[PDB]
Write a protein that binds this ligand. Structure first.
Ligand SMILES: COc1cc2ncc3c(c2cc1-c1cn(C)nc1C)n(-c1c(F)cncc1OC)c(=O)n3C
Ligand SMILES: [Zn+2]
Lengths: 465, 819, 324
């Protein structure tokens, strides 16, 4: 596989062999067996392609070295900071053999791969846009006159994101196969993730997108401030919701409804302000609703969780939703303290952005169409998920450390339980009762939009938003 | 001379035919212009992007040189030809000059469909910029300019023949995008100041109107240029604009002059403003006084009211002579007036009078009523322009919407009446948001409140707006008390294609208007496969009836041609199709071609009439034109001698065109597949040879199998059984085994009779086993497929234990079994 | 299996079938699917081919004439006798009415008796037809003399008791009796000429049509319930806005698998009942309770509403709102 298609497979083998390279560069039997086997595979590939392997290793080393650099000094500045000279990323120039890692490669059945865009140079300015560990944004200049922006992350595991992206690609193929969804252009937005080590990785930067939280509840120029100025600020809503956390459930409900009454959705104006032509506005709103529907259904099938405001991006040009930070999945969010009680995020802002009809119109029908496609392909999806979950390095089971981080062999049993739960979801068996596609969609919608469920959620989830 | 070359060529080309004496000079000029100057760098591109010369004895030389020049550096592919067509379409000319380009586009389209497969696949990522939508809308605009001109009939026929070649392909888009000039947007982006943008727009419009034939508009236009260029704003415009390259820059250079003192407009102020605009008669026009009304309104704006901008108060001479300039300039006038407003007097006055105007359009004689559509479109354009601008308060886009106090429900209803469906939906959304906003400060509730005060129900309005848009899913979104009405139930029925329910409800309800009732009954019967019942119903409808309204005749003719009932004897689509099939039966090919041409022209004209906002409005006409095209194609095959090979490639073309129509709706797919089988059965009925009768039979059998598969795909069960019945009628099977029998088994499975399909398929397997040991290469595929289908069906229904299913059926298929 | 749509499609498609059987099947399938006007126009069209005109065609024409109440289509057979008897009943000529009923009974019992009589199932059509003729003779004296409220009420009482007797009988035998009953009620409404007991006749007709809708729903038939609801809509002017038959209409929509329309009807009924009165009226107690309970159960099944709202708004309200 590596000999025939080196660009698709070389990075994965290097990542397996370079799992522990972070500590080496800075200053269980299965693990060393895997490392030795990956070393043998890389030795063979270098035997057939020396230059490619050497260049890819140098690029990976440069990426890792860039990752461990501390950016606390420049956390405040957003304009951009020049890369330090000692970083090996700047010295790299004219890398003809290596293809851009954060790029999709159309798989060629013939193995020449003659004409591909390749790295030429790296821009000397890296930009900071926020984050928990301050990820760095860098630009890669390709062989042609184009600029590719990449996101370099450290002290984080990106393998889970990559495999979630692969499952999303498979779901996209399944949706494309069906005529009913193909007519509606129902797709799941995807991005390329290239993990470099256990704690370091690089992944595509989605240009032209903005987080929904940044657009909605920004304190200085958020939508809820420019619009509805007399309503509660986001700070007051968050403070009240944090204060009512320790109280009883009825107090939580009363406080939540009080906040929601004085905090009204203003997300509908996104397409209105960005697209002034009514035809373009209608097209973008339809695309937004369809993206929300397909994302919600796919996330429910895979049990996606932790869908807070900062984990969703909206493309300014296309008005489509992109989901990031896919670490928590397979209904593991319900195992958390103060558990998540919604299949997907369908709060008042997302519903309002759909239109005056809300979920009554295109959203519901797209949900039934996606659900029907999910049902018709239940066996293939079951096989894909079964292959995925038994990955030794997949690490999906929730542990107390992640439980505390998110909110500031038993593996076989939990895995087979997740498989049976997913099977019940796919066949439509909910709470022990078989349901039609329409009935299952209605149940999911009512569970998502119920203020009773929203009130019990973590204030970090920002249900009122 | 690159700029004006195409105009000269398009003017000189037609005059060749008229008379030989002028033809000699015209031909000499064209020859010197093209053939002599091919070896020139400047004119090479302009000659390359030129309309091909007409194919005649006169133009062989010119055509040869043009073809040689165009295909230099390589020939063109399918895509290329389309890009060249649009690129030469960028040049503006009379529609008659494009006839040869239309013919060449048609030929290139019919030669290759496998390439349109590749274009359709490529345009999947960004459906908006797909070239197919652009080509269709380009042909449609070229048709609109063709109306009321000398060569409308020939142009429309070519446009329809081109549109029939593509057919109703699924474009994966919703809204038609009108073409916009790329340099125009860049030029507007160039000027940051609002007044400079007005300068550029007005000067561009005046430069464009400088060339028009009428001498009066030129006399005022030149004065307008002299006045505008003289002021300070003109000088700023010139210094900021001289950097770019544009022919208007060279055209306007002699007009510009250097003077020490800039021209100062008279800033005279009336003693009391608002006096001219206070009259109600000014704002509300009469039925046919739009041309005078717009001029009077514009000049009243110019009459000593506001107009701080120095550009304005200089446009009156041009506004007086031309009305197009008047509706062009009105929104800018109103924006300038409201910009300088103090104490909000202008805002209140204009809001009140605009409300009066918009209420007068929706009042439906009456004292003010039936306002012409052009005036409504003008005021809608004013509102649209005002919405985009930013208010002096530096507020937000929602505030920017309310430059004037507007009840957007009325404006949305007017826009819907004017066919601006997306604009109507946006205005309805704005009105709902505003209503909720004022309600909170102090859909069913909003709908009843709107019905109580404004007299227009909001939910109903959204209903017809979403219905005009044509998107299927959005229809179910609108809801209220109106689903109880039988009409809404019926339309929901035919939208979902539950034809039995629609037929029952149509029969039951009598309050429905009669014509709609019989139309729905006939349509439901036709889609249910009840052809004989429909024929007898139509025959019985004759008694106790007056003259039929045209829809009854149209439906009767459709039933006649679809049912092959040839005894029965402006022309509409199905009437023309029936007459064409009769003429093909009677070998009167001249009338056949004439009727097909008339039908094409009528369909294209009918599409030309409407506003063309949603792509869904285009699909029925595309289907009709494709049907006409296939009929015309079969006409030449039948007229001359018919061979087996020609049948082969025509059927191959049929599968290719069907492959292009993979994602199209069944409502558009079914008429073509009906016409195909009718034509094939005509060929059967009048072939008169033993050898080719079998070939026609095989083609009909394959077509009917494909029709059955297509109907099964769309969950329609009546049509497949009718197709199987026809296959029975034309193919008596003595061998007992055939490919279509497997399709019959699949159809019976689809109708939820497992025993029937299972019995047929086991009988087929036994006959196949007895007949041969799968040595026959043709029967290997059918035998393997029958075995596999039987195994899968028995596994699904659990009528047989797994061991027998595996050993006898599924393993047998593998053992039995170049693409 | 009463799959009459498939029967229509196959009868229309196949031409090798002998003609008389083909039109007989087509007419029967059209009639039992509720397509009344389509059947009438189809019968009118077939009259063009009058060369071959066999007894089954007269029989089906007369059945359609008396069922659809055309009243103009002019040995005597069963449906011919029924049509003539209804002619006489409108014409107030009771002598020929009685003689026609007598002849119909005699002929029908003769035809039944000539047979071998080996199986019980052969007896049923004759029994149904004799019951229909008996009910016609029963209404004869009611229409003959001065019509009274209590006489009509007691006749409806015998009708409902006899319907209770035929609870297990197949729909094929029950349906003609109900059709004759509704024709009787429409005739009695037409030729009454008094306002006072006209509302009584209307109420009895509404009850009969509600019972017919329930009976057809029990047999998984959808078209006839819709026809009954329609025919109720005509004879009843909806002014109060709340009535028992509207609940049956909502039930019929749910059976047709159109849940949204049924839910909308039921919610509108609940809102109108809540607004009009505070459930003090004894008459509206059962209707309001049933509407609330059915709406709650439907919402629970289809899962549009959360359990809290279903419990508080519909089910607990139905319990607290509520002589056997
Ligand atoms: C494929 O990964 C990404 C692509 C992005 N593309 C655009 C974009 C992002 C992106 C974030 C990620 C990402 C994924 N993970 C696991 N972590 C991060 C971080 N962010 C963004 C944010 F939404 C939240 N937090 C930080 C963000 O930027 C640093 C943003 O503001 N813009 C415009
Ligand atoms: Zn009028």
């Amino acid at each position: 596989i590596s000999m025939d298609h080196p660009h698709h497979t070389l990075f994965i083998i290097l990542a397996l062999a370079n799992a522990n390279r972070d500590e080496f560069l800075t200053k269980s039997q299965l693990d060393e067996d895997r490392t030795e086997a990956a070393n043998r595979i890389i030795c063979t590939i270098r035997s057939r392609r020396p230059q490619m392997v050497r260049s890819v290793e140098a690029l990976c080393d440069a990426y890792i070295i860039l990752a461990n650099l501390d950016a606390t000094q420049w956390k405040t500045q957003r304009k951009g900071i020049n890369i330090p000279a000692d970083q090996p990323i700047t010295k790299l120039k004219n890398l003809e053999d290596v293809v851009v890692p954060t790029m999709e490669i159309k798989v060629d059945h013939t193995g020449e791969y003659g004409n591909l865009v390749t790295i030429q140079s790296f821009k000397a300015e890296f930009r900071l846009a926020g984050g928990v560990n301050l990820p760095k944004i860098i630009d890669c200049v390709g062989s042609d006159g184009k600029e590719r922006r990449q996101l370099v992350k450290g002290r984080d595991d990106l393998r889970q994101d990559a495999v979630m992206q692969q499952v999303f690609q498979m779901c996209n193929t399944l949706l494309q196969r069906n005529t009913e969804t193909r007519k509606r252009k129902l797709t799941i937005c995807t991005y390329k993730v290239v993990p470099l080590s256990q704690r370091s990785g690089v992944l595509e930067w989605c240009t032209g997108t903005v987080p929904i939280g940044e657009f909605l509840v920004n304190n200085e120029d958020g939508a809820h401030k420019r619009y509805r100025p007399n309503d509660f600020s986001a700070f007051q809503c968050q403070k009240k919701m944090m204060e009512v956390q320790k109280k009883s459930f009825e107090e939580k409900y009363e406080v939540f409804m009080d906040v929601c009454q004085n905090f009204q959705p203003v997300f509908r104006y996104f397409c209105m302000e960005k697209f002034l032509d009514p035809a373009i506005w209608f097209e973008k709103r339809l695309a937004y609703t369809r993206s929300v529907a397909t994302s919600s259904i796919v996330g429910y099938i895979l049990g996606l969780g932790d869908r807070h405001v900062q984990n969703i991006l909206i493309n300014e040009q296309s008005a489509e939703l992109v989901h990031i930070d896919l670490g928590v999945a397979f209904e593991q969010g319900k195992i958390l303290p103060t558990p998540e009680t919604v299949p997907f995020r369908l709060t008042r802002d997302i519903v309002d952005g759909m239109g005056i009809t809300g979920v009554e119109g295109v959203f519901r029908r797209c949900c039934e169409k996606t659900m029907e496609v999910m049902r018709n392909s239940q066996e293939t999806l079951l096989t894909i998920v079964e292959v995925l979950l038994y990955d030794p390095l997949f690490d999906w089971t929730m542990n107390p450390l992640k439980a505390l981080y998110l909110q500031q062999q038993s593996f076989n049993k939990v895995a087979e339980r997740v498989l049976m739960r997913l099977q019940e979801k796919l066949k439509g068996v909910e709470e022990g009762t078989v349901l039609s596609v329409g009935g299952q969609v209605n149940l999911l919608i009512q569970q998502a939009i119920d203020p009773k469920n929203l009130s019990r959620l973590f204030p970090g989830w920002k249900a009122w938003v | 001379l690159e700029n004006h070359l195409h105009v000269i060529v398009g003017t000189l080309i037609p005059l060749v035919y008229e008379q030989v004496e002028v033809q000699k000079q015209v031909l000499d000029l064209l020859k010197y212009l093209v053939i002599d100057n091919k070896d020139n760098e400047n004119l090479y591109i302009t000659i390359k992007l030129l309309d091909p010369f007409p194919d005649h004895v006169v133009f062989k030389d010119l055509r040869i040189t043009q073809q040689k020049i165009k295909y230099s550096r390589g020939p063109f592919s399918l895509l290329e030809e389309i890009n060249h067509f649009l690129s030469v379409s960028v040049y503006d000319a009379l529609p008659l000059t494009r006839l040869e380009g239309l013919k060449d586009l048609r030929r290139q389209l019919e030669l290759h469909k496998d390439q349109m497969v590749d274009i359709m696949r490529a345009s999947q990522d960004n459906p908006q910029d797909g070239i197919m939508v652009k080509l269709v809308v380009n042909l449609l605009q070229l048709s609109k300019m063709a109306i009321n001109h000398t060569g409308e009939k020939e142009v429309l026929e070519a446009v329809g023949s081109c549109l029939g070649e593509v057919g109703p392909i699924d474009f994966s888009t919703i809204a038609i995008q009108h073409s916009k000039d790329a340099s125009y947007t860049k030029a507007l982006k160039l000027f940051e100041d609002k007044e400079l943008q007005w300068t550029f727009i007005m000067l561009t419009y005046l430069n464009n109107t400088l060339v028009e034939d009428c001498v009066k508009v030129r006399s005022a236009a030149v004065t307008c240029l002299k006045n505008i260029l003289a002021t300070k704003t003109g000088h700023s415009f010139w210094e900021i604009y001289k950097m770019t390259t544009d022919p208007m820059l060279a055209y306007l250079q002699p007009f510009r002059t250097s003077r020490k003192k800039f021209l100062e407009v008279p800033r005279f102020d009336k003693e009391n403003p608002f006096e001219g605009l206070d009259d109600i008669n000014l704002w509300i026009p009469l039925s046919e006084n739009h041309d005078i009304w717009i001029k009077t309104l514009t000049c009243a704006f110019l009459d000593s009211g506001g107009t701080k901008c120095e550009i304005l108060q200089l446009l009156k001479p041009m506004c007086e002579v031309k009305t197009d300039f008047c509706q062009t300039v009105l929104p800018y006038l109103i924006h300038d007036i409201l910009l300088q407003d103090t104490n909000e007097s202008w805002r209140n006055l204009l809001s009140t009078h605009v409300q009066g105007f918009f209420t007068s359009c929706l009042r439906h004689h009456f004292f003010r009523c039936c306002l012409d559509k052009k005036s409504q479109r003008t005021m809608l354009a004013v509102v649209d322009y005002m919405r985009r601008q930013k208010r002096p308060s530096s507020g937000t886009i929602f505030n920017d919407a309310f430059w004037l106090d507007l009840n957007y429900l009325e404006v949305a209803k007017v826009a819907q009446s004017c066919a601006a469906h997306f604009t109507a939906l946006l205005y309805a959304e704005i009105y709902a948001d505003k209503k909720s906003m004022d309600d909170q400060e102090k859909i069913s509730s909003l709908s009843e409140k709107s019905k109580e005060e404004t007299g227009i129900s909001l939910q109903d309005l959204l209903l017809e707006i979403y219905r005009s848009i044509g998107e299927p899913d959005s229809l179910y979104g609108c809801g209220g008390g109106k689903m109880l009405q039988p009409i809404t139930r019926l339309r929901t029925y035919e939208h979902e294609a539950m034809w039995g329910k629609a037929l029952v409800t149509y029969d039951l309800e009598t309050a429905i208007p009669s014509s709609t009732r019989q139309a729905g009954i006939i349509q439901a019967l036709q889609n249910l496969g009840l052809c004989h019942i429909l024929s007898v119903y139509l025959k019985g409808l004759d008694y106790e009836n007056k003259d039929w309204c045209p829809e009854l005749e149209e439906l009767h003719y459709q039933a006649a041609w679809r049912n092959m009932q040839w005894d029965h004897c402006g022309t509409s689509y199905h009437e023309s199709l029936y007459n064409a099939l009769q003429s093909l039966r009677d070998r009167e090919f001249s009338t056949f071609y004439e009727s097909l041409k008339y039908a094409r022209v009528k369909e294209v004209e009918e599409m030309c009439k409407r506003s063309l906002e949603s792509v869904y409005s285009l699909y029925p006409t595309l289907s009709r034109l494709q049907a006409i095209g296939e009929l015309e194609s079969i006409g030449e095959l039948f007229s001359r001698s018919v061979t087996h090979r020609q049948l082969s490639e025509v059927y191959i073309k049929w599968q290719k065109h069907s492959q292009l129509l993979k994602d199209s709706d069944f409502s558009f797919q079914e008429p073509i597949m009906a016409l195909r089988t009718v034509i094939l059965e005509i060929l059967m009925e009048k072939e008169m040879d033993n050898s080719q009768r079998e070939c026609i039979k095989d083609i009909l059998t394959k077509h009917l199998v494909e029709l059955s598969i297509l109907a099964r795909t769309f969950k329609n069960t009546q049509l497949p059984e009718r197709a199987i019945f026809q296959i029975k009628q034309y193919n008596s099977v003595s061998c007992g085994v055939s490919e279509w029998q497997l399709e019959e088994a699949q159809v019976f499975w689809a109708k939820k009779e497992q025993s029937l399909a299972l019995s047929i398929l086991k009988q087929m397997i036994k006959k196949l086993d007895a007949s041969c040991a799968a040595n026959n290469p043709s029967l290997k595929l059918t035998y393997t497929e029958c075995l596999r289908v039987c195994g899968n069906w028995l596994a699904e229904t659990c009528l047989e234990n797994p061991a027998v299913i595996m050993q006898t059926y599924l393993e047998k298929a593998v053992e039995v079994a170049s693409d």
